[PDB]
Ligand binder design. Structure first.
Ligand SMILES: Nc1ncnc2c1ncn2[C@@H]1O[C@H](COP(=O)(O)OP(=O)(O)OP(=O)(O)O)[C@@H](O)[C@H]1O
Ligand SMILES: Nc1ncnc2c1ncn2[C@@H]1O[C@H](COP(=O)(O)O)[C@@H](O)[C@H]1O
Ligand SMILES: [Ca+2]
Lengths: 359, 350
């Protein structure tokens, strides 16, 4: 009995087996329709296909393309029979209960899994760090979440969602590079811009000081080799693109920065657990992979929080796959074997058992 | 040990297991093992009745007696472990998560009973009695009560009587001097949990309520003989219910105005059931605080002199809330045990 762990993100689906330290299959969470194509095949045939994202802001909105994504994951990507593997799934914070019920119904009736579990992505990220209490900033590709978790339970009254993630940062980087004369308007240009964002962008400790240094000197300018032999230089955009996380007004967003949303989440919690949340600030997701984001978050939260408070920001190097890592840790636990919603339990109780067993 | 026995034994290893936790877990195990017996439903009904009245000692004794009567089908070692765990459990007034969950569900069930076959005449007469009790400085815009919403609104508006009309009843009371609530004004805290469930406690995804602010109330630990300290099985949402003395005053006016009513006892019990449902569901009080106000010696004398037998909102069909609280108990206990194992695994991994 090998457990399947499948973290379905807005931009990337990361699937694999429990006990592994890395998602064996990380592919774009896109479905191409002209029969349909899912993942890298749909991305390659971008022109011939119409691409749709079944998951937006971490919430599944199109269940048909979600079924196609899961079928491709089980058969075309992991190459396993779903009926012989208990499949642990992941869900977004504050996910609608109807979505969880549909998830379990599709897992059990369409794929005939013997068992399944649904866990909140931020809680799995916290599990990957060995914590049950703490605040997690899970910024993936479509949404950012500030999720305080007390003893494995994500407090619904203090979770906030910020519609600002890697997609917005990539679009902002495209806009700035266009402001410099670099034409990035096509999907392939979007992908290479995302590559530059991943490889060169970083979070500045002091945005104004970094801007002044970029204006004065050229030490912050880095060279990048475009696919068509061109070489382009990027200067102050290396820290301007991630700064939208802390200054959303860069793209016209009226919301607050990730540090301010973190402080607001901690303030929405009881004063007795605020110390635990402050001391356990866990970074999770691809959009948290910028260099210097942990130091900047620590500095900004220290500014916002009371002076005597102890603030610790936890940003593991594998925080891009921390959700899947926590899911794999969960599904490979001996005490977790009884939390699997079994086919018998689903048959005797219906999909609503997901609220009673996965909570 | 089979899978079910192993799951039960692991759940009983929960460090924060209390008497309610233990009762729910062992009743679930006994239903899954000996439930096929013809006499089991009577035992389950008696255990649920004991649990609703917080007769935890009697419920645990009955459960242990049944386990010893079926020591062969269950197992001598398993029964010995259950007996050992039975004497090791206690109750924390600040932390009774299974009890708070069960009381929220039971308040919802009380409301469901109330709405079915709802008699508006009882609460119209209660509103009339309220008008002849409340002082002149308290307004009452509920001219007539026609729906359950208006009756609940009147029940909740009975709070304007405090410190004016019930002072005599509180003075005559012997238990209200044992009320232990901190005078400190701690403000309000956010929650998505219903009723008297604590804000940080885990909850079913379909059981959460829209986020709202609720008053933060602490125990007066310096009080000698405090109600919470004396009765730890009672979940502390507040101390003894002082507004229920105002309700008793209004009910005294109700009874003196309807001494010839043949169904007076039924109407008074209906009013008490609505009061308990509203106070548990709104998070103002737990069941036993209100009920123990109703069980005061002089309040009991008041209700006995009117030939009224209070059932204290006790119902005989609590199977759904009992089983849902069992599921909640199992979830909390298994999750805590898995959290222990996961913390150990990640710590050993790094
Ligand atoms: N090293 C990196 N630096 C900056 N951005 C990165 C890096 N690696 C990945 N990203 C970006 O992070 C996003 C992917 O993150 P992740 O896989 O956690 O999201 P997801 O699961 O698809 O989304 P969701 O937020 O809905 O859960 C993409 O926008 C990607 O461009
Ligand atoms: N009808 C009501 N409306 C609003 N708050 C109430 C009501 N009844 C009780 N409370 C609150 O419940 C707590 C306990 O009050 P008491 O029941 O008078 O001991 C206090 O915080 C009260 O303000
Ligand atoms: Ca994610």
């Amino acid at each position: 009995t090998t457990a399947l762990v499948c973290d379905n993100g807005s931009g990337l689906v990361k699937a694999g087996f429990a006990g592994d330290d890395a998602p064996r299959a990380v592919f774009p969470s896109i479905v191409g329709r002209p029969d349909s194509y899912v993942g890298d095949e749909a991305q390659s045939k971008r022109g011939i296909l119409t691409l749709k994202y079944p998951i937006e802001h971490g919430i599944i909105t199109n269940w048909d393309d979600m079924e196609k994504i899961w079928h491709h994951t089980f058969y075309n990507e992991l190459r396993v029979a779903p009926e012989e593997h208990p499949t642990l799934l992941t869900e977004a914070p504050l996910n609608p209960k109807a979505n969880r019920e549909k998830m379990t119904q599709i897992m059990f009736e369409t794929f005939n899994v013997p068992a399944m579990y649904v866990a909140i992505q931020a809680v799995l990220s916290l599990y990957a760090s060995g914590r049950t209490t703490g605040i997690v900033l899970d910024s993936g590709d479509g949404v950012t979440h500030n999720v305080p978790i007390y003893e494995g339970y994500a407090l619904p009254h203090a979770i906030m969602r910020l519609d600002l993630a890697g997609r917005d940062l990539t679009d902002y980087l495209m806009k700035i590079l266009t402001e410099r004369g670099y034409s990035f308007v096509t999907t392939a240009e979007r992908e290479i811009v995302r590559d530059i964002k991943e490889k060169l962008c970083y979070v500045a400790l002091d945005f104004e000081n970094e801007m002044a240094t970029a204006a004065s000197s050229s030490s912050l300018e880095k060279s990048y080799e475009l696919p068509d032999g061109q070489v382009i230089t990027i200067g102050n955009e290396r820290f301007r693109c991630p700064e939208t996380l802390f200054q959303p007004s860069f793209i016209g967003m009226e919301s607050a920065g990730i540090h301010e949303t973190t402080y607001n989440s901690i303030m929405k919690c009881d004063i007795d657990i605020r110390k635990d949340l402050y001391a356990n600030n866990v970074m999770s997701g691809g959009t948290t992979m910028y260099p210097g984001i942990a130091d900047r978050m620590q500095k900004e939260i220290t500014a916002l929080a009371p002076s005597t408070m102890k603030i610790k920001i936890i940003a593991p190097p594998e925080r891009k796959y921390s959700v899947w890592i926590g899911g794999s840790i969960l599904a490979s636990l001996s005490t977790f074997q009884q939390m699997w919603i079994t086919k018998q339990e689903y048959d005797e109780a219906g999909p609503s058992i997901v609220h009673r067993k996965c909570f | 040990y089979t899978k079910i026995e192993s799951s039960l034994l692991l759940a009983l290893d929960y460090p924060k297991l209390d008497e309610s936790d233990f009762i729910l877990l062992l009743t679930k195990f006994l239903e899954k093992k000996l439930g096929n017996n013809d006499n089991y439903p009577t035992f389950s009904k008696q255990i649920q009745k004991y649990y609703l009245e917080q007769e935890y000692k009697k419920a645990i004794e009955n459960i242990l007696r049944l386990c010893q009567e079926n020591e062969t089908l269950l197992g001598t070692n398993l029964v010995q472990r259950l007996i050992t765990k039975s004497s090791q459990v206690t109750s924390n007034p600040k932390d009774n998560e299974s009890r708070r969950f069960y009381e929220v569900l039971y308040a919802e069930h009380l409301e469901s009973i109330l709405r079915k076959d709802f008699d508006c005449s009882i609460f119209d007469e209660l509103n009339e009695a309220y008008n002849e009790v409340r002082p002149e400085y308290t307004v009452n815009d509920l001219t007539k009560i026609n729906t359950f919403e208006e009756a609940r609104k009147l029940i909740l508006a009975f709070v304007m009587l405090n410190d004016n009309v019930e002072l005599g009843l509180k003075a005559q009371s012997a238990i209200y001097q044992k009320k232990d609530r901190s005078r400190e004004e701690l403000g309000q805290v956010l929650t998505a949990n219903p009723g008297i469930m604590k804000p940080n406690s885990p909850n079913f995804a379909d059981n959460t309520v829209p986020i709202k602010k609720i008053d933060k109330i602490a125990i007066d630990e310096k009080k000698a003989g405090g109600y919470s300290k004396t009765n730890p099985q009672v979940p502390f949402v507040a101390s003894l219910s002082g507004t229920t003395y105002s309700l008793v005053v209004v009910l005294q006016k109700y009874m003196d105005k309807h001494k010839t009513d043949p169904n007076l006892e039924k109407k008074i019990n209906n009013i008490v059931m609505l009061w308990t449902s509203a106070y548990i569901k709104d998070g103002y009080h737990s069941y036993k605080e209100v009920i123990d106000i109703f069980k005061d010696a002089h309040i009991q004398s008041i209700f006995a002199r009117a030939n009224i037998k209070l059932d204290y909102a006790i119902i005989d069909d609590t199977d759904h809330e009992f089983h849902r609280a069992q599921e909640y108990t199992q979830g909390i206990a298994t999750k805590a045990m898995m959290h222990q194992e996961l913390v150990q695994k990640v710590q050993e991994k790094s």
